[PDB]
RNA sequence: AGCCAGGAUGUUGGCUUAGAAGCAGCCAUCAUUUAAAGAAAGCGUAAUAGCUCACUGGUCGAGUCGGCCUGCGCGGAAGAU
């Protein structure tokens, strides 16, 4: 269990680091304005511009959305772990141990993507 | 051959894409209500939407379709006293 324990916190830390690197607030802000623009119906009259806007939005959402998921997913995992601890059941514990890996992998992938920006 | 009607459902098939809803592609090209309805032949769009088409049901009420063999013609075919 000690390794599992180590993995929960470490993952969180790395997520935090990633977020910091991103400087996510700016991105969020951009998304917001972009979202607002999209909501306004006059943007779609000019097609190319609209398309561009759409392109801009999704990525912004997704990076930010990914981050959100990580934040939330991690929390969920923690909760699960807590539950397991409280109720001495093996299956739950096992689940707690396992589910975290996927999130970590996702995070890693995201980081990799961030790294290799050039075409 | 025209003419009148439908030209549905799962479904907007997923994806990758910025979006993809027959129609950017890439791929499967299946099944349903059955009279019949292509996971779609063309137009159309931001993409849907929208407008046709395929096949099929009515009207009508006799011939009709496009290959082959050969005859004769047509275009292709502009020049300097
Ligand atoms: Mg001749």
Phi-psi region of A94 (alpha: psi -120 to 50; beta: other; left: phi over 0): alpha
Q: Say if CB A108 and CB A19 are below 8 A apart.
A: no
Experiment used for this model: cryo-EM
Chain B positions with a protein C-beta closer than 7 Å: 18-19, 46-47
Residues for chain A: how many in total? 119
Q: Find the Å distance, CA of residue A58 to C1' of nucleotide B24.
A: 20
Q: How far are the Cα atoms of A26, A54, A114 from residue A51, in angstroms, in the given order? A: 21, 5, 23
Task: Tell how far the Cα of A106 is from the centroid of ligand 1, in angstroms.
Answer: 76
Alpha carbon of A97 to ligand 1 centroid (Å) = 90
């Amino acid at each position: 269990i000690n390794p599992v324990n180590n993995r929960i916190q470490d993952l969180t830390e790395r997520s935090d680091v990633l977020r910091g690197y991103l400087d996510y607030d700016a991105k969020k802000e951009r998304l917001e304005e972009v979202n607002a623009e999209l909501e306004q119906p006059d943007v779609w009259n000019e097609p190319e511009r609209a398309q561009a806007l759409g392109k801009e939005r999704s990525s912004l959402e997704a990076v930010v959305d990914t981050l959100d998921q990580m934040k939330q997913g991690l929390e969920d995992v923690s909760g699960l772990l807590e539950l397991a601890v409280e109720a001495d059941d093996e299956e739950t514990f096992n689940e707690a141990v396992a589910e975290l890996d996927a999130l970590e992998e996702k995070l890693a992938q995201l980081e990799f993507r961030r790294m290799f920006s050039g075409e």
